[PDB]
Predict the structure of Spike glycoprotein.
Amino acid sequence: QTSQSIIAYTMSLGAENSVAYSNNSIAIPTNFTISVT
Amino acid sequence: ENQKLIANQFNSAIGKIQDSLSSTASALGKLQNVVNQNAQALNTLVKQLSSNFGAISSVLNDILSRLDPPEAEVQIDRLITGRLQSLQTYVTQQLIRAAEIRASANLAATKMSECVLGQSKRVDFCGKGYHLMSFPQSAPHGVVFLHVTYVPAQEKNFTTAPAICHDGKAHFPREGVFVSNGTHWFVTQRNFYEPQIITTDNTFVSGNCDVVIGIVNNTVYDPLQPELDS
Amino acid sequence: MIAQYTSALLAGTITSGWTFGAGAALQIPFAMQMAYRFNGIGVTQNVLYENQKLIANQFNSAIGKIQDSLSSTASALGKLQNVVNQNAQALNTLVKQLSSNFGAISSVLNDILSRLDPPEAEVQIDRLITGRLQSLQTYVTQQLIRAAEIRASANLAATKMSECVLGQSKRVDFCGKGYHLMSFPQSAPHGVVF
Amino acid sequence: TEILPVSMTKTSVDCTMYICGDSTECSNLLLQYGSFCTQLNRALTGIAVEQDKNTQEVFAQVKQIYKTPPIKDFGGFNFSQILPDPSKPSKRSFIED
Ligand SMILES: *[C@@H]1O[C@H](CO)[C@@H](O[C@@H]2O[C@H](CO)[C@@H](O)[C@H](O)[C@H]2NC(C)=O)[C@H](O)[C@H]1NC(C)=O
Ligand SMILES: *[C@@H]1O[C@H](CO)[C@@H](O)[C@H](O)[C@H]1NC(C)=O
Ligand SMILES: *[C@@H]1O[C@H](CO)[C@@H](O)[C@H](O)[C@H]1NC(C)=O
Ligand SMILES: *[C@@H]1O[C@H](CO)[C@@H](O)[C@H](O)[C@H]1NC(C)=O
Ligand SMILES: *[C@@H]1O[C@H](CO)[C@@H](O)[C@H](O)[C@H]1NC(C)=O
Ligand SMILES: *[C@@H]1O[C@H](CO)[C@@H](O)[C@H](O)[C@H]1NC(C)=O
């Protein structure tokens, strides 16, 4: 990719999510996907 | 209560399986990989019938009828040493790869048992997410498990508390999590969001409001009083 | 970056626990998921929710004992230092097989080429090639057997990450002796410490 | 504390240098042995990609990368020597160090 070219970058390991942790924070999924893996 | 949704997501996902198999090259990456492993094993085996290993040639007829016997015996001995080491190498990598295939097949038998013949509670054993049911497909020299998994999708945030003591008795969730949207406290199963009102049916009593930290106050209702009201 | 994956695994385990191994990370206090992991071994959640200081102190003392036994006992990392040593001896035997003549005149290439004309240098170099080539097949086939061992233990470590870190395993003695609560990956060299 | 091995040291061998270091006719006779180092190197390369598979099936169990918040009220569970320390340039933790 950028026309588009070949790029050599440090691998991201994925998006740097910061979990909204606290002694009272909870996350619940309201929906689901039937994944036919 | 979501039967159309699960059925339609299953149908859409198997349709995506069709599309991925038709379009993606390595959609059968593991089984096409193993078929190619067998193909290269056999092809290397056959091409070793074109390898010298120090001999003049590999087609035995020209070794026999190209030069004098006295050292033709030695040369054919070298050729058979090379062929026999090639066959031993082939057979021992067939044994190592058959230990791989037998780990895969003991895993596929364990997967048939715990995925098709039952439900596996092992995490990520029948696919990423909470496994529902697998389907065997008699794919060439292998099996394709349509790992129907449950993947929870739309996360949120709520306020939680380890225990909810009503009148000095810490209440705990029988199975689920104590959560709140900001003003009302609900208990929800750990893997899908149902806000359920708090009652002694899904909460049990142990301890007091001090030995546990994070405990908050909320009413834990009782169903006997409204029934006795009339 | 192996340690960054390990730190993300620890952060998901502390913050989300098992729920990040199914889909996205579902944040949850650490006491919550430790209580739920008691609940998953037939021990009620109230045990931790009323002994929380005791569980925390026993955990801290036990990991302190882990660090003490690591700093003091040489064979604390018996399995991983064992595997690192197997790799080291495999490579060192491979190297010293360049000091093995396998019945030939010498094990060094230049002396073989210089001392003998091709008439018999051909036979000698054939002996070196076949000896070091059986050495390579021997090394590589024990690397395949040992990589089947490392892949059995790595499928075991992935199963253990899933069922011990990314979840709680009800399999008896699968994540340690006793009723498993939660494992922590620690990316020790060429392996993982649970 | 279970010490599980995950990855072997990822080794790739060039026979034209291993068997035949700085020697040309040795490589010619190695080719005269047909094809063993093609499949030997494919075995070792499968081993190395297998080590990366091992590492990413053990450690890369999730797509994202999650960070421990600066405030750590983990009910009292001290993870200081478990969680990484921001002091070391090659970042690890005390236990991991
Ligand atoms: C968590 O444990 C660490 C030890 O790994 C504690 O840090 C030590 O604390 C003691 C007493 O305060 C000091 O004498 C040491 O010098 C500290 N060592 C290091 C490396 O920091 C830390 O205080 C503990 N944290 C909590 C909240 O208990
Ligand atoms: C849940 O996800 C499905 C698709 O997987 C979507 O069609 C639906 O609208 C979402 N919400 C509900 C409440 O089902
Ligand atoms: C929930 O609210 C908190 C603020 O208290 C926020 O940090 C967090 O990101 C929210 N949840 C999500 C999933 O964004
Ligand atoms: C929380 O849910 C309850 C239950 O319906 C509702 O009455 C209340 O208004 C909600 N509060 C917020 C802030 O969403
Ligand atoms: C939770 O954390 C907040 C801020 O970190 C703090 O003010 C509060 O006292 C804590 N409560 C408990 C029960 O730990
Ligand atoms: C709960 O109520 C008791 C007495 O009614 C009080 O002592 C305690 O501080 C309250 N806790 C919270 C978190 O409001």
